[PDB]
Symmetry: D2
Subunit: 454 residues, 4 copies
Amino acid sequence: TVRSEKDSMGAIDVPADKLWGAQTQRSLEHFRISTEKMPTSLIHALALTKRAAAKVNEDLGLLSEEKASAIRQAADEVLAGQHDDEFPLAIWQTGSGTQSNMNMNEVLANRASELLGGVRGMEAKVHPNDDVNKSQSSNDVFPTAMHVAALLALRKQLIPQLKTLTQTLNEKSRAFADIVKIGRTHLQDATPLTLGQEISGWVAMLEHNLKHIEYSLPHVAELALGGTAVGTGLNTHPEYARRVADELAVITCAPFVTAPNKFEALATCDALVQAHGALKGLAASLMKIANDVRWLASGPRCGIGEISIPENEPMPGKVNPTQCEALTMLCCQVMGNDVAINMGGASGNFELNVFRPMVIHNFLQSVRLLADGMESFNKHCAVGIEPNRERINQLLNESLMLVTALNTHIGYDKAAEIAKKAHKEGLTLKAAALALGYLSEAEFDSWVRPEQMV
Amino acid sequence: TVRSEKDSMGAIDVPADKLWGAQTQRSLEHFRISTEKMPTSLIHALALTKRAAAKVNEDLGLLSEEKASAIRQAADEVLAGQHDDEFPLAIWQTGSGTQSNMNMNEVLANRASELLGGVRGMEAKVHPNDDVNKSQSSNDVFPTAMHVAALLALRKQLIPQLKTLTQTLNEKSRAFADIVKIGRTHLQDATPLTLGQEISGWVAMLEHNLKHIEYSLPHVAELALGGTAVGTGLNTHPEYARRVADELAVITCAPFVTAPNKFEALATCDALVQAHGALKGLAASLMKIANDVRWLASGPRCGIGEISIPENEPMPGKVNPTQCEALTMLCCQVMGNDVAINMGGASGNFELNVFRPMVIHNFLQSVRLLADGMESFNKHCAVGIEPNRERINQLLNESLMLVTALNTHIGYDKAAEIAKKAHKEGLTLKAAALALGYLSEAEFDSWVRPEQMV
Amino acid sequence: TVRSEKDSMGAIDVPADKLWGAQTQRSLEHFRISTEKMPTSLIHALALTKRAAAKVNEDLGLLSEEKASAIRQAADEVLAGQHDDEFPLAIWQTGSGTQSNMNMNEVLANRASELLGGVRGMEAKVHPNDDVNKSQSSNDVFPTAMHVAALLALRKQLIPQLKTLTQTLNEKSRAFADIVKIGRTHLQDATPLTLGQEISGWVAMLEHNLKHIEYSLPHVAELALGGTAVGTGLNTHPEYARRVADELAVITCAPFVTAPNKFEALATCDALVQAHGALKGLAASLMKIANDVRWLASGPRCGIGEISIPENEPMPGKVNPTQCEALTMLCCQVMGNDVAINMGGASGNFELNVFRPMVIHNFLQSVRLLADGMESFNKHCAVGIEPNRERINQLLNESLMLVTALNTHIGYDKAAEIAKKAHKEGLTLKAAALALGYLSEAEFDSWVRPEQMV
Amino acid sequence: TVRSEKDSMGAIDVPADKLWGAQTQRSLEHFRISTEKMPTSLIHALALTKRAAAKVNEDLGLLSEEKASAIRQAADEVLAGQHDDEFPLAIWQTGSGTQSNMNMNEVLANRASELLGGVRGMEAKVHPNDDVNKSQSSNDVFPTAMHVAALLALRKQLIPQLKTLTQTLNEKSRAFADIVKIGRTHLQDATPLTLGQEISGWVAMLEHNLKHIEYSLPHVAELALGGTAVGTGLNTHPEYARRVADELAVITCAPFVTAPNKFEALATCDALVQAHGALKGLAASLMKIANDVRWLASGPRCGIGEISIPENEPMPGKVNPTQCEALTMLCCQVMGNDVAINMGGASGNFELNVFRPMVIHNFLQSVRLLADGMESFNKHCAVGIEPNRERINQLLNESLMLVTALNTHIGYDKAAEIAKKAHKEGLTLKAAALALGYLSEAEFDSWVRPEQMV
């Protein structure tokens, strides 16, 4: 029920029913820190990187077609979800991520050996370093997998959910474009606007956020692979960097390119620091939108109550805005994640930044949170937003903001005293214009038109 | 392979092999956000809270001995690790944590029913709300479980690992108390001190941190249970708050007490905001210590190299300080976690703070990271720290800092010109005192005594 | 209109009408970075430190009574506000703060020389290094001034304003202890409580914050002076550390003591990292209180409107809560300051932390903001908080939360259908109990008693 | 020595020698919070906004040529630095910034009146609201001044200093392109690279940062002016928004445009949240570069010592890297500023974000710090960076990294045992290849060529 695997330090027992090797077993035993492991997206990006590396090595005659094809088949099994329990290492490992690199090397090598009729272990047909890490160093693969995982998650998860939410709110803005409501500035009653105009603010924010996220993608698309140990490219084929970047782009349809400067690519996590800046921008925007929604829906009777939202969980009328709560809670998380990333990104030394598992742990979490959170908020809240037209009108007409519709029909002097009297006395603006008798109730209803004040 | 469970909203299918109920199934389906779930420590704190609530209800004749005893037996099974797959809810749920409260209510109720020869579900012998949540509201249990989990993890995990690491470094400080080395200020050569004096700085920092963490514990030990819905205690026995706090203290041996002001306890997460302030203090101290260790061990030949550390992973002499890398990486994480907690803690509204799953998610993660990280750093690094005495002496004697040992034997004028000549010329201070001939090599070796300059 | 001053690097022109010297002029010209300078509190703490150092040197016969007395008289002039334009250095200077140390040395030395009938400059009677920095190093004075300034500002500014605000809100809580209002959880209508009970939550938070701030003071009271260059105390009298700490305590009435471990005191800013943790705790509490106040006062007609606040600035009824805006804005600032401090505190190296001007800049700013902000919020807002009793009662009685007062007079079944009918139909709970005729309006007014539900 | 000025609240005394009015005096007395005031750049942006507003009002016949021309002349005096003591308001004021808007209205109105032969005060010829705020609301001017100030400071200060620093390091990278040095990964000796290759990493980082900053400028260039009170544009000429944006662009040569969605422009600070994300990216990059410089220059004898830097301040050889200290200290500040900005940006409510003075205070500080800090670092440090060629070669040749130059001349087996022997024994790789006699010293010097390993 165990197997003896070897590395440059000796032999160690690994679980017989597992595909990993000596370096993984050592890391697994030396970093028993908390519960965070590499996320599946990073595992898949690592498998993709080894699949592209294998194909390019084959193309260059540096690795046999049998070994190359067996490696790509094993990597496709990882990508297909067959080997999730084969990657047990903690986030809190060596700062370069090289132990997770070896975890992929060993799992792919053993599984490739099986696929060629060999065994897993010392006598395997495919070797983790010699074959699966061929033309790679210990230092330039993990940074590559970080950018592959990050770019694919922004393109395939976050941007599509962002676009869907924007379209829902754009539709809602159009449907409610002629519902006039009271404005609120400093939380006080203010000049009116339409519910559709207010939502159009939310829509415009999400469109700006999309642009900012898109501006960050070209830097993330630059890959370190080919820099080898310190960025010089020593001990790799001079076409390898460009060729692997080219293969990754083919098999993902994403515009990966090799990093024009490998020293910047290995010494920093700057592309992710910058990209996460755009995500904390989105988190601040989503906080605002979520808060507007839950405040406008507050009630049923002692809040604002201008809109209603769907009731999805198990005393009538009480609807806790639980999607707004999950959303605001994960927006706080993104702000915190940004500080952790900023500290790691600032803390590179010389030729290599060794804060990488932590940086990518936070970055991919922020993407999951923002993508899944907008998907959940959209389907369980935003699509169901409806006005409470009686309440909106009650608030608007019983307010004192509409007095300014009277200044060319009575002068600022008399309207001001209607406003003052109605307020000291607790009256409408109609009732206070009648008691002082500067107006008839037909004169009011024709002069104070909220629909022309927007 | 399914079961129909009911709540105030209707009936829903749950997995037949699971013990949860309708509210858990709904939350599980409505918050498909990322992968973070409640940590085991929080689950256990919830089970402890229900076990104490049951015992107190029994004491007050509010619940039968059969039901009460079956609930405590089920909770003990949770505490014993038999039901880990029965708690599937996300962190990113309702902000009060009430859905995880219901998850514990339903699992304990069904399992209790089984333990009394009943079924799980509609016809169960024990009811989630009526029995397991008896004398509790939906709002005051989750805050209680937060403080129970946090206090127990600080007392049982973090403080013992902190104490162990402090003792290791205190021993190392004693063993190396008479090894003189060059000091470094602004990263430049400076006035000497002993390696034991330098480590005593690390020791003193960890002793201060322990005090700061201990000062935060009395506020965390205040429990919200008994405040019920808004803090007034309406709809609970007037002795319930004190009695449950008293029972929790009995069964954990921790000094839990009921919160003197339930409005502060429900409306805020202030005790954890303050407590996490002490943890980010520890993270900043640990960053410094870890960096000192990896810098002092840098080499083998082109760094500082004054100490050696154990080599635990698989080109001689290269030892990557991987424990220092994991430690500094998790210290960044704690700084980020603190910002997320601060934002949640600042964002309470009226009678209830609804940022709680996020706050406790971050807080318990910081405790795991700091506790497990000091345990790992201690056993795989700190215990093995050794001086490189030849290197320490080489640096010290070949430096220019020891010139000031000559000012009462030659005056500040001649020593200054030895220092200047040795530096322009690339000589020792002995060699430069010989070429200008102000001293004999026996006069030097008797006057420049590093051991008296500390 | 210039004067030639000298240091170990040569001669440089300083403004003739200024008291500073060569090192100050150099720093002034080399760090033209932004506009932040040392705050007055830090200048005063530096002057206090030199006044105590002078007195102790005199006591030890290390400095003449004439020079010592002239130095203390000059320092008293600084403390008296006569020399504010004599300290022009930026925060963004050398990381040890040693240039601001020299700024105090030179200003005090020249002014002391004047006070003895000498000139300012090369021929002065008192020397900046030889006399004013006597028994001090370049490294242990600035950390001392940081802790002196921080401790005095917490004791003399922040804690008294915190105590005053707490007393105002405690009085308001007592005055409104029997005004019943609707509770709000998740922003939804909930179980009632009194306005005084709600404010008592604010009061309890501020009392907890005071305790947390007080727990941080003993570590701040530890002073580095006497550690000299690297903490060994080399080149100072063996009683100097304790004696100066003792003199500082005499002349400030604050419990300053010498740091038991000088290596921790020079290598870190841990005491301020920990102390600022308590201040960001206060900022989160103050955010919550300020938000409760501005939300409860929102209106005049389309918000909550349960309380009124004073109108201090220049359309009736609109009162922008501008004190709440200043307060919440400075609470954000404290959260940001905490991150800057945490990064600096984590970034010490070997024998000296050289992030100190930045750390103390942020820390003293947070204290000014919190102290002055609570003083301003108290006098221009909190003291004037009044209930709007008609509005509070309107909301409470027109809500659906009071239905549960009927369950022992009608059973949960009939009350639930009153609640449902009133809500589908837009009625009071009285009106809906009449239409279905389960109650008389005298039966209602006797059964639904809000004053017994708190 | 006082003057009675009036607003809608009454009359108040202002200093007779000052140009401000009633609203400024009130704000000045009600927000005695700390010492931070609006920075000059914001004052100038406000003056620019009023100068453009005046010109456009004149164009539309809404204001006389005399009044319009007098306002623009007064604003030009502000821009010319004649009125710096006329703007005394705190950052910690009303959250909309409207009191600083009124401060500019009153100062320009009084000074304009003087320029027309009138008095300052009640009888002035030009009115603050009626004339200087004409066609503007209280809510849309301050956000406009924020974006004007931010865009101009990024274009005129930060980007030019960033470009200058990049050019210096690009020149240094070219000059040192063939100096081979030891690489460092995880702080351990690693594969060699040239000093010019390493600096090219710094250069590439700064070029990426420039691109990221440039991507943020189009959103900052969108101006809120014309949205008036809540974004609807009610009570302003329908061409005003576009016309003022157009005039601002003329007189600044910056591409200002009117915000396509005024609700997003008033309800959020999203453009600055996003733009500050790029600045904290730059801060993390600058931290890394500064740390590389001070570590490489550490010495003179017990550090790395591979480069030298200029000595600008007043024991030979000790050069404290004080420019690196100021730079790293202000990079921490930017990280903290980003959190304060993120919290303010996330905290908008409905139609107006009222965290604006705090947001712009932090944002313009980060720009001053980064711009002035790179200017100071460039001129007092970076331009003077020189290699220590003897030290670089000593480290490189005495290291064990060059063993791999022997594997096709001896096989990995014998080289590995040279590496091992030299390390256990404390020898060079030449000396250890001689003792075991696998090589002649002429065979070594011809095979181990560092210049071909990069």
